[PDB]
Design a protein around this ligand. Sequence first.
Ligand SMILES: COc1c(OCCCCCCC(=O)O)cc2oc3cc4c(c(O)c3c(=O)c2c1CC=C(C)C)C=CC(C)(C)O4
Ligand SMILES: [Mg+2]
Ligand SMILES: [Zn+2]
Length: 323
Amino acid sequence: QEDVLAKELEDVNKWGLHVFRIAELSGNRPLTVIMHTIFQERDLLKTFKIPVDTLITYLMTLEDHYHADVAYHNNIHAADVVQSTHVLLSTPALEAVFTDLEILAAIFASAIHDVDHPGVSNQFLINTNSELALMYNDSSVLENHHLAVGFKLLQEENCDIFQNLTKKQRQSLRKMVIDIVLATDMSKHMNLLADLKTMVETKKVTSSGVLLLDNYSDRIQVLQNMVHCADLSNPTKPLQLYRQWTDRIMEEFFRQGDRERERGMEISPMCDKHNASVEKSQVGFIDYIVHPLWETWADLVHPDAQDILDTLEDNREWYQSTI
Ligand SMILES: COc1c(OCCCCCCC(=O)O)cc2oc3cc4c(c(O)c3c(=O)c2c1CC=C(C)C)C=CC(C)(C)O4
Ligand SMILES: [Mg+2]
Ligand SMILES: [Zn+2]
């Protein structure tokens, strides 16, 4: 069974990796094995002097803190986001643009960006006076908690994968990771996209024809949008993957809808398993959120992402045609 997993992990650099198969083949360790493969692929263990055993122990603990009962926001989603971010980092327009530290930050951010997700929305947690919402004062509740658990786990025995970074490297990675994960909060999406359009309209490309990011604010904005695109990349994937993601998000949205009913609350949009248009929701999700974002990304890196964009638009057409 190990050589089968190893042959599937050969697709780790391709948009559309069979992540669910890898989840199966790995004994439900897609995050561990995909992160380890990506770290091996980018030589991050030699570069940052990460003991392999420390890397593995941290990854399995992190994966353990994704919930098995959560159909969408689980370790497979994390593995998927990790691997999609990895692909986007290698886009030719960003070639040589980012440092090893920033590359590490973006990959590590993707891995933790939904850890310990309970399966209910920020608004749900706010509207039910959840402990998490009280602790975090209703502000990017889930995303602050993902960050806190993601860092907390580095402190467990033989889990500090950053133990041979300088104090200054860890400070800079901590800030980048926090900035990246907070940007995955969807209430930040409009302003994020606005700033990405502005960067596109003021794009400078260097002599080599790659992107010029001369300051932290520009560099971190790209990583924020890169990971955000990766988080919203499901409708850009091959249809058999996309549809399974839709099934999973709907199961989870419906399971929040049931709990809202149990409490007599008003049912959130798209969470009522009695009045739900899965297909129309996906078309409006693409039309209003995913396609604007990804079209703007494709602009920033033109033409590197044209195949991703084509697939998104075929998939939009597909879901639409089913109505
Ligand atoms: C919460 O963001 C969403 C949205 O959620 C995406 C769910 C999948 C995220 C995967 C990544 C991860 O959560 O880890 C899905 C959404 O789906 C929509 C679907 C729509 C429409 C929408 O406006 C939205 C969203 O705004 C929308 C939004 C934006 C939210 C606000 C403005 C408050 C309009 C019309 C119809 C009903 C046809 O379809
Ligand atoms: Mg999230
Ligand atoms: Zn996510």
